[PDB]
Ligand binder design. Structure first.
Ligand code: 39Z
Length: 276
């Protein structure tokens, strides 16, 4: 297949804006397909010493082959810019719906938590750690299944993710692992049910204090079995988090009672519960 050029597309609105990149909606002219095209300015990548990160992002995505991840269809470049042609998830970030519906009911929480768990199982199976897992990075496709994106900061088996989601070992050891993603998962479940991330404060530094102290609370309107799972994820000792290999992996995680009624085999063929 011949290399694609920007002229092959009618570019539209900006879908997303990062520190080092912008994502734009593009309809390919010959096929009429829409793609989310990530555009990186080379000069900028270089002056900020991000080449390894862009390289790492491209390499990971090429390796991923699973419905719960944003797919990479193509890349090309002109003299100033890199272009990554990516899945366009029509319903945008999970964060939106949290902010929109306020907080998920038990059924919706269970469904989307389970899809996220299944995605982590796959990713961790490939020896890849995301390291910046959070609702903004978890997108929803036209059928409201998740697609996890944003792999520039993954590690394949230094970097710190987003404050509310970083694990304690990041703040004390500076060396993460598969378990750091499970911590972030704990935070996301809590936020799904509570409407808000568990650790939060006036500024980043206060946030980090609450984390290493495990200073956080459960609302009373909090699904109990969901509460019990969260506590088995938000654990200072990374080797004691459910789902981590020192806890014998995703079997015990998926067998948690909160997931009692979940069919793990075909989640993406299942029909998600309406979000309201
Ligand atoms: C922000 C966004 C989308 C993305 C963001 C990325 O970082 C990577 C891929 C991607 N595909 C999208 O569709 C979006 C917003 C609204 C619809 N899609």
């Amino acid at each position: 297949p011949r290399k694609k050029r920007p002229e092959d597309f009618k570019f539209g609105k900006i879908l997303g804006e990062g520190s080092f990149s912008t994502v734009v909606l593009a309809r390919e002219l010959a096929t009429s397909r829409e793609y989310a095209i990530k555009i990186l300015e080379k000069r900028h990548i270089i002056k900020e010493n991000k080449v390894p990160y862009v390289t790492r992002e491209r390499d990971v995505m090429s390796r991923l082959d699973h419905p719960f991840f944003v797919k990479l269809y193509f890349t090309f470049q002109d003299d100033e810019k890199l272009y990554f042609g990516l899945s366009y998830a029509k319903n945008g970030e999970l964060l939106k719906y949290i902010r929109k519906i306020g907080s998920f009911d038990e059924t919706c929480t269970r469904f989307y938590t389970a899809e996220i768990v299944s995605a982590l199982e796959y990713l961790h199976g490939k020896g890849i750690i995301h390291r910046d897992l959070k609702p903004e990075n978890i997108l929803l496709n036209e059928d409201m299944h998740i697609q996890i994106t944003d792999f520039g900061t993954a590690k394949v088996l230094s970097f710190v993710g987003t404050a509310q989601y970083v694990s304690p070992e990041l703040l004390t050891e500076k060396s993460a692992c598969k378990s750091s993603d499970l911590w972030a998962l704990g935070c996301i479940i809590y936020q799904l049910v509570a409407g808000l991330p568990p650790f939060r404060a006036g500024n980043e530094y206060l946030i980090f204090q609450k984390i290493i102290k495990l200073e956080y609370d459960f609302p009373e309107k909090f699904f109990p079995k969901a509460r019990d799972l969260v506590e088995k994820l938000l654990v200072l000792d990374a080797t004691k988090r459910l789902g981590c290999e020192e806890m014998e992996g995703y079997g015990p995680l998926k067998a948690h009672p909160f997931f009692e009624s979940v069919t793990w085999e075909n989640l993406h063929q299942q029909t998600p519960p309406k979000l309201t």
